[PDB]
């Protein structure tokens, strides 16, 4: 009854690709339950109309839990049960998370996309390419120095760090190229967890390969002893990198416990990147489906925001609705209640917590898309509580989801609301800001309309940095806030709806394979480490089965 | 261009059928590649095995080896006479592809396919390894950060990290910098993945459960008291194993001639036996009458190691064994320059021949047949041939033109291996004993095979050996980590060097197999791209690859 | 050239006589420099002390301070009227000499001599310090190598190494690399020697035995449990002391006007009180009627610190205190550019004046007289002067042209200090208490002296403070480690900045004295030569120096 203990009947993905309209020649199988669909499927369909895009998001996430994917999948399965033609697009998780704090499922309970074990491990080798397409470029840099450094790159300015898909601290700050004039040039760098590599970020925003390629040739690796930028393009590396991602460009097909087809592609950080799965998996999902559920990392002040301002902006998508997830316990948590006494009733801590969800509602409205809250059901939640949460939603259609437990069935109501609102309230989508605005301007719009922050404070580094980019020509790019997700403010302790506060960005990075990434707090946790109790320590694989994952 | 040679492949699932594999025992990675389960072997555990045409080669030279081509091209001929035989090769490190380009699996009309899927990601067998290693490293470094419960000395740590790219800048580095939250600063580096003890364990393991344990014994470092610490004491054994549940399965692909070819594993031939994985062949055996397998470097390194590492543990008995070699190759062994291979010379071709002749002899010593295999080249004229032809006066000697003729040019030799394997019944025996002495095992490997009048051990090579034997890692085999371009450690002594001597400077322990006794600086465990990389030149058309 | 100003010196041994020093209490370092023993003080322990014309200055600016010149030039005048007074300065770091050249001790005809022996090695007082520090570091690093018996965390080690040269490349490094015999790899760096907590201890110690113990309390780092470890737990206390047995003695030299001048010590004025050594003055006192001493930076930093660090422990009571300042200097404080000092402006000269006026006030707060000292410059015309003259409407205000007139231009002011020190009897009191709170001590130093409406402490500044007080290093004084170019942390706010606020980012503990509360990035504990160093240009003739 544990989530993985729920291993049962999948249909061969060819049957699936078939029973969806995908040609057999456009399916690169991996087992009988995995596939890399050609981008031709899309390409030849581009003229038909798009399906309905339903973005699922959630409330300020707290340690109490909410359940985003679980719903995302449940919502799907439900729409399917109600006869609707639909797919789901979700990200392939990072590997390290499996060996440090144990791997989880694509959602959970009866709400999840499978084969679980694969998606949670090597899945179809997507990440590996990213890891290598990345480390190769890293070596072309180190090589170029080692070769006479024609381009004249002042090594101490190299930003292109190296990467690996495991949680390893020590690799955060290391010195490279040691040993003598025959081992490269001495320097300072480190490793970032793969999923956080800009390369992955690009895969999640590219149109196809030739596009993804040009992007690569835009990646900044460092600067000359003169100040001018040097890109991977100058190291002529886009083709090679490109060749490594040749097979990672295609989305991957896999189903739900209930068989509904779904795409698992991309999957980047959601503070240093848009926390969304690739546009290709979705765009291909929009022709092959009449309904498309997809989700975004972190609460709606981030994932949602970037989903709307970066993904959709580039992809030309136009969300029709948007479900937002919230539990009672997490809410009460936002109302001040500790973790321990959460099970105890308290409409009061619940009422002031609502301010949280009630803010996201309002924000999601700041985009022109209709919102529907989903109350992830939980044993302790009382009627005196749920019932309040419902009427409290004096703004958007509410509905409890029992998808975790009852699979598709427990998700029937929500579908009926989503569907209901997918008819009477057509969406009027539109980016929160404009690309031809000041950089600090863009940041305020967000901190001001979304985080509900009074204003923005910046450090001397933060300024020179910005000032550089704008004159260096990247001012008109999209912005990607990298704040703490456990709060509407860059203060992880300020739960609920924090008022009269100010965001302080203290550093500003750049991702020319996309845009400007400004971090507020130490939101630079680009490489997590393992716990004193490495989940990998209680790991073991039977002479047959795998135990403890 | 040998790449242009991309035409007419077949469903592997079918081949898996036309070999006796239940459909439920093949994981497809496209329609032309497929992981085959271990369940096959296990059940056909008792079924009659097959022969073992272990192909090997002379002494590498800037002229042109021919080891692999010849190996598959013979299989393109062998079964091309209605025979039940396969292949068992190795995936070529990735890094080389964007550094010094890439090449087909073997050569000419005998190259296993598809080409690209190989030099590249393939069934991502390396990546699996890569992670099963780095992680270990990650757990070691993490331990320290935790409180170093095992009281390990970060400075004695022998477990480096791993990436599969030619990165020089990564051969010597310092990690852990940054303070109490970044862990413990210390010195390590990166070695190419294929060069991982892990890839090795892979190439020498019965099954996952074997591999799992075969992992636990590998020493990561020692404590302040000098007490060895193993992945075991760390609890990363099974963990690592699960990252490998998919690579432990042998891959499956064909030849241009659709001959069932297994391509599983890829270890460093000098620091390790340099042969393909066991399971692949131990399983390939059952599923066939014959099995054509090759090893790394020359016959003094790869062949010897195949005989004392692989066969040893896995219990094979190399019914046959061939030895490749070309004219121009053996000529150089006579003083013949690289810009002087174009011309004929029946005297240098002669002396140089001593190379081919020395190997021959060594082969026979393992209680297994031998046969000469000759590469065909546009300049190896008549006069030259009729000389080497008769010179091999010692055992079978057939010419093979598989390159430009496919399985055809291999027919001649084909018959020969059958013929000389039908009448010549061998009794395979290890050229040395696992109970001798690390010091004496090197002794008989240096003496009889290379030709060392003696072996010398520097102040280091000594201290270690002792520690190893004082610990217990002394009853293990020995992988001679010396320069491959001569029986002697001297990379300049071509031919059949005499009166020499081999000195062992260092000695690294691999508790995931045997003992690597390094000679000269054969520590190129991490190569490095050139000033004119194929990477800078590789591009993928809005359609397909161009220049890889 | 002020260097050319090298003419007519005298035997120090004689001066030591004409002051009341037994010949057996002077260690000569040439005929014109001499270490005087501590035995002098000790015996004249009860003898009547003297006055303390503590000279200080305005707020530094790219125009020209004048702190030291004025200080000695007043002594060239004071005793130039038959008076028993000396001096007490500091040796200028070596590194600057081959980087941005060197200068005389003070300026004009008031520079202590010989010049060269100072900017250079002198009586090698630094070197002594330099070694007494590095060694400690050497013992710390050695301990680790031994087995880290104290269970110290190499990563928590706060004790860097030390060299007295402007080396950038040495500000962040990793040592210990190389293996079990090279010790434990870790991250540290080098800070200039004069900037050493050691030089400091020196400048604030009763005698060697005091200094010795004053050493033992200095924390080098902590353990894995967070338990402080001190030089004491290391046993380097006395050791270090013996390296210092010779520097603990004050040096002795004269003025161009042979006025007995003590030049002992030289601490960083921002990270430390920036005043000369105690013993020098506590001893200089006895041996005189008066003693003219100065401190580092402005009066908000050096003066305040002199009053709460030095006087505190050593029990002085600054009978007087002067405050230097020039026209052009206070003009800039009115918006006056550097390329705009040449001209007159009685309005900017006015506002800017607020600087001079703010300081004045603060002075009085310590219960000690005050008096304006004005630098004389070729462009500080009549109109300009008569303005600043009367503007100082608050306490004594005399002009001094010591520069081009020697002890002469100091006469005017001379009389004044005597006059206003004869009729104005002060009751010296610390501007804050040692029993308050680190948080509240910063409070009253920020409020009253700088002018902070409040003080803010970042997440770090907080955690530390707490640890310090939770340990005990909380009952100590406070050395404000902030930018010296303004009462405010903002290096751009000239004049008398108001409404501001001071934020403390960091907080470093110096258990060899007090607490350094760093503000902006005032961590320039290791400067760096320019792209056009005086080193590249210094040459010593087959006779004497040229360009230093």
PDB file of C-alpha atoms in Angstrom, chain B residues 246-439:
ATOM      1  CA  UNK B 246      20.761  -2.299 -16.627  1.00  0.00           C
ATOM      2  CA  UNK B 247      24.401  -2.463 -17.728  1.00  0.00           C
ATOM      3  CA  UNK B 248      24.920  -5.838 -16.110  1.00  0.00           C
ATOM      4  CA  UNK B 249      22.850  -7.061 -19.080  1.00  0.00           C
ATOM      5  CA  UNK B 250      24.889  -7.656 -22.255  1.00  0.00           C
ATOM      6  CA  UNK B 251      23.992  -5.644 -25.295  1.00  0.00           C
ATOM      7  CA  UNK B 252      22.992  -7.173 -28.609  1.00  0.00           C
ATOM      8  CA  UNK B 253      23.637  -6.022 -32.174  1.00  0.00           C
ATOM      9  CA  UNK B 254      24.670  -7.580 -35.466  1.00  0.00           C
ATOM     10  CA  UNK B 255      27.400  -7.315 -38.092  1.00  0.00           C
ATOM     11  CA  UNK B 256      26.960  -5.784 -41.518  1.00  0.00           C
ATOM     12  CA  UNK B 257      26.415  -9.500 -42.147  1.00  0.00           C
ATOM     13  CA  UNK B 258      23.835  -9.751 -39.353  1.00  0.00           C
ATOM     14  CA  UNK B 259      26.026 -12.143 -37.347  1.00  0.00           C
ATOM     15  CA  UNK B 260      24.835 -12.044 -33.688  1.00  0.00           C
ATOM     16  CA  UNK B 261      27.308  -9.754 -31.923  1.00  0.00           C
ATOM     17  CA  UNK B 262      27.539  -9.072 -28.191  1.00  0.00           C
ATOM     18  CA  UNK B 263      29.144  -5.746 -27.305  1.00  0.00           C
ATOM     19  CA  UNK B 264      29.316  -5.490 -23.521  1.00  0.00           C
ATOM     20  CA  UNK B 265      31.982  -3.854 -21.325  1.00  0.00           C
ATOM     21  CA  UNK B 266      35.168  -1.901 -22.042  1.00  0.00           C
ATOM     22  CA  UNK B 267      38.056  -1.926 -19.501  1.00  0.00           C
ATOM     23  CA  UNK B 268      41.526  -0.355 -19.726  1.00  0.00           C
ATOM     24  CA  UNK B 269      43.727  -3.099 -21.185  1.00  0.00           C
ATOM     25  CA  UNK B 270      46.957  -2.015 -19.448  1.00  0.00           C
ATOM     26  CA  UNK B 271      45.752  -1.235 -15.898  1.00  0.00           C
ATOM     27  CA  UNK B 272      43.215  -4.031 -16.397  1.00  0.00           C
ATOM     28  CA  UNK B 273      42.815  -7.231 -18.458  1.00  0.00           C
ATOM     29  CA  UNK B 274      41.329  -5.118 -21.236  1.00  0.00           C
ATOM     30  CA  UNK B 275      38.900  -7.877 -22.340  1.00  0.00           C
ATOM     31  CA  UNK B 276      35.094  -7.659 -22.707  1.00  0.00           C
ATOM     32  CA  UNK B 277      32.654  -8.656 -19.902  1.00  0.00           C
ATOM     33  CA  UNK B 278      32.260 -12.257 -18.762  1.00  0.00           C
ATOM     34  CA  UNK B 279      28.458 -12.717 -18.618  1.00  0.00           C
ATOM     35  CA  UNK B 280      28.368 -11.648 -22.302  1.00  0.00           C
ATOM     36  CA  UNK B 281      30.532 -14.587 -23.390  1.00  0.00           C
ATOM     37  CA  UNK B 282      29.612 -17.107 -20.647  1.00  0.00           C
ATOM     38  CA  UNK B 283      26.076 -16.538 -21.887  1.00  0.00           C
ATOM     39  CA  UNK B 284      27.036 -16.104 -25.548  1.00  0.00           C
ATOM     40  CA  UNK B 285      28.648 -19.540 -25.222  1.00  0.00           C
ATOM     41  CA  UNK B 286      25.460 -21.444 -24.352  1.00  0.00           C
ATOM     42  CA  UNK B 287      23.556 -19.607 -27.081  1.00  0.00           C
ATOM     43  CA  UNK B 288      26.026 -20.829 -29.686  1.00  0.00           C
ATOM     44  CA  UNK B 289      28.413 -23.446 -31.044  1.00  0.00           C
ATOM     45  CA  UNK B 290      31.282 -20.961 -31.113  1.00  0.00           C
ATOM     46  CA  UNK B 291      32.131 -17.494 -29.705  1.00  0.00           C
ATOM     47  CA  UNK B 292      34.751 -15.153 -31.255  1.00  0.00           C
ATOM     48  CA  UNK B 293      36.295 -12.900 -28.551  1.00  0.00           C
ATOM     49  CA  UNK B 294      39.203 -10.402 -28.461  1.00  0.00           C
ATOM     50  CA  UNK B 295      41.230  -8.513 -25.836  1.00  0.00           C
ATOM     51  CA  UNK B 296      43.156  -5.263 -25.412  1.00  0.00           C
ATOM     52  CA  UNK B 297      46.663  -4.426 -26.656  1.00  0.00           C
ATOM     53  CA  UNK B 298      49.114  -7.097 -27.764  1.00  0.00           C
ATOM     54  CA  UNK B 299      49.118 -10.762 -26.856  1.00  0.00           C
ATOM     55  CA  UNK B 300      51.717 -10.237 -24.132  1.00  0.00           C
ATOM     56  CA  UNK B 301      49.285  -8.016 -22.213  1.00  0.00           C
ATOM     57  CA  UNK B 302      45.698  -8.662 -23.335  1.00  0.00           C
ATOM     58  CA  UNK B 303      46.089 -12.327 -24.230  1.00  0.00           C
ATOM     59  CA  UNK B 304      48.086 -13.181 -21.108  1.00  0.00           C
ATOM     60  CA  UNK B 305      45.571 -11.284 -18.940  1.00  0.00           C
ATOM     61  CA  UNK B 306      42.581 -12.886 -20.680  1.00  0.00           C
ATOM     62  CA  UNK B 307      44.153 -16.222 -19.739  1.00  0.00           C
ATOM     63  CA  UNK B 308      44.885 -15.391 -16.095  1.00  0.00           C
ATOM     64  CA  UNK B 309      42.042 -13.039 -15.127  1.00  0.00           C
ATOM     65  CA  UNK B 310      38.930 -13.894 -17.120  1.00  0.00           C
ATOM     66  CA  UNK B 311      39.311 -17.620 -17.861  1.00  0.00           C
ATOM     67  CA  UNK B 312      40.609 -18.055 -14.330  1.00  0.00           C
ATOM     68  CA  UNK B 313      37.523 -16.893 -12.374  1.00  0.00           C
ATOM     69  CA  UNK B 314      34.942 -17.667 -15.078  1.00  0.00           C
ATOM     70  CA  UNK B 315      36.365 -21.123 -15.867  1.00  0.00           C
ATOM     71  CA  UNK B 316      36.858 -20.876 -19.629  1.00  0.00           C
ATOM     72  CA  UNK B 317      39.332 -23.019 -21.607  1.00  0.00           C
ATOM     73  CA  UNK B 318      40.210 -21.143 -24.894  1.00  0.00           C
ATOM     74  CA  UNK B 319      39.873 -24.107 -27.275  1.00  0.00           C
ATOM     75  CA  UNK B 320      41.533 -21.960 -29.934  1.00  0.00           C
ATOM     76  CA  UNK B 321      43.221 -18.565 -30.187  1.00  0.00           C
ATOM     77  CA  UNK B 322      44.283 -16.621 -33.242  1.00  0.00           C
ATOM     78  CA  UNK B 323      46.952 -13.936 -33.611  1.00  0.00           C
ATOM     79  CA  UNK B 324      46.551 -11.053 -36.042  1.00  0.00           C
ATOM     80  CA  UNK B 325      49.498  -9.210 -37.639  1.00  0.00           C
ATOM     81  CA  UNK B 326      50.248  -7.305 -40.823  1.00  0.00           C
ATOM     82  CA  UNK B 327      53.354  -6.994 -43.010  1.00  0.00           C
ATOM     83  CA  UNK B 328      54.187  -3.299 -42.590  1.00  0.00           C
ATOM     84  CA  UNK B 329      53.489  -3.753 -38.864  1.00  0.00           C
ATOM     85  CA  UNK B 330      56.172  -6.447 -38.416  1.00  0.00           C
ATOM     86  CA  UNK B 331      58.449  -4.522 -40.774  1.00  0.00           C
ATOM     87  CA  UNK B 332      58.703  -1.545 -38.407  1.00  0.00           C
ATOM     88  CA  UNK B 333      59.876  -4.105 -35.838  1.00  0.00           C
ATOM     89  CA  UNK B 334      62.887  -4.288 -38.119  1.00  0.00           C
ATOM     90  CA  UNK B 335      63.668  -0.580 -37.957  1.00  0.00           C
ATOM     91  CA  UNK B 336      61.214   0.349 -40.709  1.00  0.00           C
ATOM     92  CA  UNK B 337      60.061   4.004 -40.283  1.00  0.00           C
ATOM     93  CA  UNK B 338      56.442   5.107 -40.699  1.00  0.00           C
ATOM     94  CA  UNK B 339      57.266   7.055 -43.868  1.00  0.00           C
ATOM     95  CA  UNK B 340      59.094   3.944 -45.098  1.00  0.00           C
ATOM     96  CA  UNK B 341      56.299   1.350 -44.950  1.00  0.00           C
ATOM     97  CA  UNK B 342      55.368   2.039 -48.590  1.00  0.00           C
ATOM     98  CA  UNK B 343      58.357   0.045 -49.860  1.00  0.00           C
ATOM     99  CA  UNK B 344      59.303  -3.624 -49.713  1.00  0.00           C
ATOM    100  CA  UNK B 345      62.126  -5.122 -47.672  1.00  0.00           C
ATOM    101  CA  UNK B 346      62.401  -8.864 -47.142  1.00  0.00           C
ATOM    102  CA  UNK B 347      65.161  -8.492 -44.518  1.00  0.00           C
ATOM    103  CA  UNK B 348      63.542  -6.031 -42.092  1.00  0.00           C
ATOM    104  CA  UNK B 349      60.268  -7.846 -42.686  1.00  0.00           C
ATOM    105  CA  UNK B 350      62.325 -10.829 -41.547  1.00  0.00           C
ATOM    106  CA  UNK B 351      63.940  -9.714 -38.280  1.00  0.00           C
ATOM    107  CA  UNK B 352      60.888  -7.689 -37.329  1.00  0.00           C
ATOM    108  CA  UNK B 353      59.000 -10.946 -37.771  1.00  0.00           C
ATOM    109  CA  UNK B 354      60.568 -12.031 -34.461  1.00  0.00           C
ATOM    110  CA  UNK B 355      57.678 -10.127 -32.870  1.00  0.00           C
ATOM    111  CA  UNK B 356      55.061 -12.350 -34.477  1.00  0.00           C
ATOM    112  CA  UNK B 357      57.215 -15.423 -33.711  1.00  0.00           C
ATOM    113  CA  UNK B 358      57.720 -14.502 -30.048  1.00  0.00           C
ATOM    114  CA  UNK B 359      53.975 -14.064 -29.478  1.00  0.00           C
ATOM    115  CA  UNK B 360      53.210 -17.416 -31.196  1.00  0.00           C
ATOM    116  CA  UNK B 361      55.377 -19.295 -28.707  1.00  0.00           C
ATOM    117  CA  UNK B 362      53.831 -17.604 -25.686  1.00  0.00           C
ATOM    118  CA  UNK B 363      50.363 -18.545 -26.959  1.00  0.00           C
ATOM    119  CA  UNK B 364      51.167 -22.243 -27.006  1.00  0.00           C
ATOM    120  CA  UNK B 365      52.342 -22.026 -23.411  1.00  0.00           C
ATOM    121  CA  UNK B 366      48.787 -21.753 -22.096  1.00  0.00           C
ATOM    122  CA  UNK B 367      47.854 -25.163 -23.465  1.00  0.00           C
ATOM    123  CA  UNK B 368      45.805 -23.830 -26.347  1.00  0.00           C
ATOM    124  CA  UNK B 369      46.134 -23.880 -30.161  1.00  0.00           C
ATOM    125  CA  UNK B 370      47.374 -20.885 -32.149  1.00  0.00           C
ATOM    126  CA  UNK B 371      47.167 -19.671 -35.769  1.00  0.00           C
ATOM    127  CA  UNK B 372      48.573 -16.767 -37.761  1.00  0.00           C
ATOM    128  CA  UNK B 373      46.182 -14.179 -39.142  1.00  0.00           C
ATOM    129  CA  UNK B 374      47.557 -11.723 -41.671  1.00  0.00           C
ATOM    130  CA  UNK B 375      46.167  -8.338 -42.563  1.00  0.00           C
ATOM    131  CA  UNK B 376      45.891  -7.585 -46.266  1.00  0.00           C
ATOM    132  CA  UNK B 377      47.228  -4.239 -47.486  1.00  0.00           C
ATOM    133  CA  UNK B 378      47.604  -2.703 -51.035  1.00  0.00           C
ATOM    134  CA  UNK B 379      51.399  -2.659 -50.563  1.00  0.00           C
ATOM    135  CA  UNK B 380      52.027  -6.084 -49.013  1.00  0.00           C
ATOM    136  CA  UNK B 381      53.191  -7.391 -52.416  1.00  0.00           C
ATOM    137  CA  UNK B 382      53.882 -10.989 -53.450  1.00  0.00           C
ATOM    138  CA  UNK B 383      57.579 -11.099 -52.515  1.00  0.00           C
ATOM    139  CA  UNK B 384      56.749  -9.738 -49.053  1.00  0.00           C
ATOM    140  CA  UNK B 385      53.919 -12.218 -48.437  1.00  0.00           C
ATOM    141  CA  UNK B 386      55.633 -15.476 -49.505  1.00  0.00           C
ATOM    142  CA  UNK B 387      58.261 -14.539 -46.925  1.00  0.00           C
ATOM    143  CA  UNK B 388      56.055 -13.980 -43.865  1.00  0.00           C
ATOM    144  CA  UNK B 389      53.907 -16.818 -45.192  1.00  0.00           C
ATOM    145  CA  UNK B 390      56.608 -19.457 -44.736  1.00  0.00           C
ATOM    146  CA  UNK B 391      58.308 -17.626 -41.887  1.00  0.00           C
ATOM    147  CA  UNK B 392      55.435 -18.486 -39.519  1.00  0.00           C
ATOM    148  CA  UNK B 393      56.907 -22.002 -39.607  1.00  0.00           C
ATOM    149  CA  UNK B 394      55.359 -23.067 -36.293  1.00  0.00           C
ATOM    150  CA  UNK B 395      51.551 -23.300 -36.685  1.00  0.00           C
ATOM    151  CA  UNK B 396      48.586 -22.466 -38.951  1.00  0.00           C
ATOM    152  CA  UNK B 397      49.159 -19.373 -41.131  1.00  0.00           C
ATOM    153  CA  UNK B 398      46.290 -17.925 -43.253  1.00  0.00           C
ATOM    154  CA  UNK B 399      45.858 -14.506 -44.930  1.00  0.00           C
ATOM    155  CA  UNK B 400      42.617 -12.514 -44.447  1.00  0.00           C
ATOM    156  CA  UNK B 401      41.289  -9.685 -46.656  1.00  0.00           C
ATOM    157  CA  UNK B 402      38.101  -9.001 -44.648  1.00  0.00           C
ATOM    158  CA  UNK B 403      38.613  -5.242 -44.971  1.00  0.00           C
ATOM    159  CA  UNK B 404      37.622  -4.730 -48.642  1.00  0.00           C
ATOM    160  CA  UNK B 405      35.990  -8.167 -49.091  1.00  0.00           C
ATOM    161  CA  UNK B 406      33.803  -8.578 -46.023  1.00  0.00           C
ATOM    162  CA  UNK B 407      33.230 -12.020 -44.548  1.00  0.00           C
ATOM    163  CA  UNK B 408      34.739 -13.182 -47.850  1.00  0.00           C
ATOM    164  CA  UNK B 409      38.406 -12.342 -47.320  1.00  0.00           C
ATOM    165  CA  UNK B 410      37.973 -14.286 -44.084  1.00  0.00           C
ATOM    166  CA  UNK B 411      36.897 -17.591 -45.616  1.00  0.00           C
ATOM    167  CA  UNK B 412      40.433 -18.901 -46.151  1.00  0.00           C
ATOM    168  CA  UNK B 413      41.337 -18.390 -42.482  1.00  0.00           C
ATOM    169  CA  UNK B 414      37.801 -19.390 -41.468  1.00  0.00           C
ATOM    170  CA  UNK B 415      38.258 -22.981 -42.609  1.00  0.00           C
ATOM    171  CA  UNK B 416      41.661 -22.972 -40.864  1.00  0.00           C
ATOM    172  CA  UNK B 417      40.358 -22.141 -37.361  1.00  0.00           C
ATOM    173  CA  UNK B 418      37.699 -24.844 -37.706  1.00  0.00           C
ATOM    174  CA  UNK B 419      40.274 -27.283 -39.121  1.00  0.00           C
ATOM    175  CA  UNK B 420      42.953 -26.578 -36.505  1.00  0.00           C
ATOM    176  CA  UNK B 421      40.353 -26.509 -33.673  1.00  0.00           C
ATOM    177  CA  UNK B 422      38.819 -29.810 -34.798  1.00  0.00           C
ATOM    178  CA  UNK B 423      42.067 -31.778 -34.794  1.00  0.00           C
ATOM    179  CA  UNK B 424      43.934 -29.747 -32.145  1.00  0.00           C
ATOM    180  CA  UNK B 425      42.339 -30.422 -28.666  1.00  0.00           C
ATOM    181  CA  UNK B 426      43.794 -28.133 -25.993  1.00  0.00           C
ATOM    182  CA  UNK B 427      44.015 -28.458 -22.209  1.00  0.00           C
ATOM    183  CA  UNK B 428      43.818 -24.870 -20.922  1.00  0.00           C
ATOM    184  CA  UNK B 429      45.988 -24.067 -17.896  1.00  0.00           C
ATOM    185  CA  UNK B 430      46.917 -20.808 -16.169  1.00  0.00           C
ATOM    186  CA  UNK B 431      50.516 -19.742 -16.892  1.00  0.00           C
ATOM    187  CA  UNK B 432      50.989 -19.188 -13.147  1.00  0.00           C
ATOM    188  CA  UNK B 433      49.377 -19.896  -9.779  1.00  0.00           C
ATOM    189  CA  UNK B 434      47.177 -17.756  -7.556  1.00  0.00           C
ATOM    190  CA  UNK B 435      48.986 -19.227  -4.544  1.00  0.00           C
ATOM    191  CA  UNK B 436      52.525 -18.257  -5.654  1.00  0.00           C
ATOM    192  CA  UNK B 437      53.872 -14.847  -4.614  1.00  0.00           C
ATOM    193  CA  UNK B 438      52.985 -11.428  -6.002  1.00  0.00           C
ATOM    194  CA  UNK B 439      56.749 -11.239  -6.436  1.00  0.00           C
TER     195      UNK B 439
END
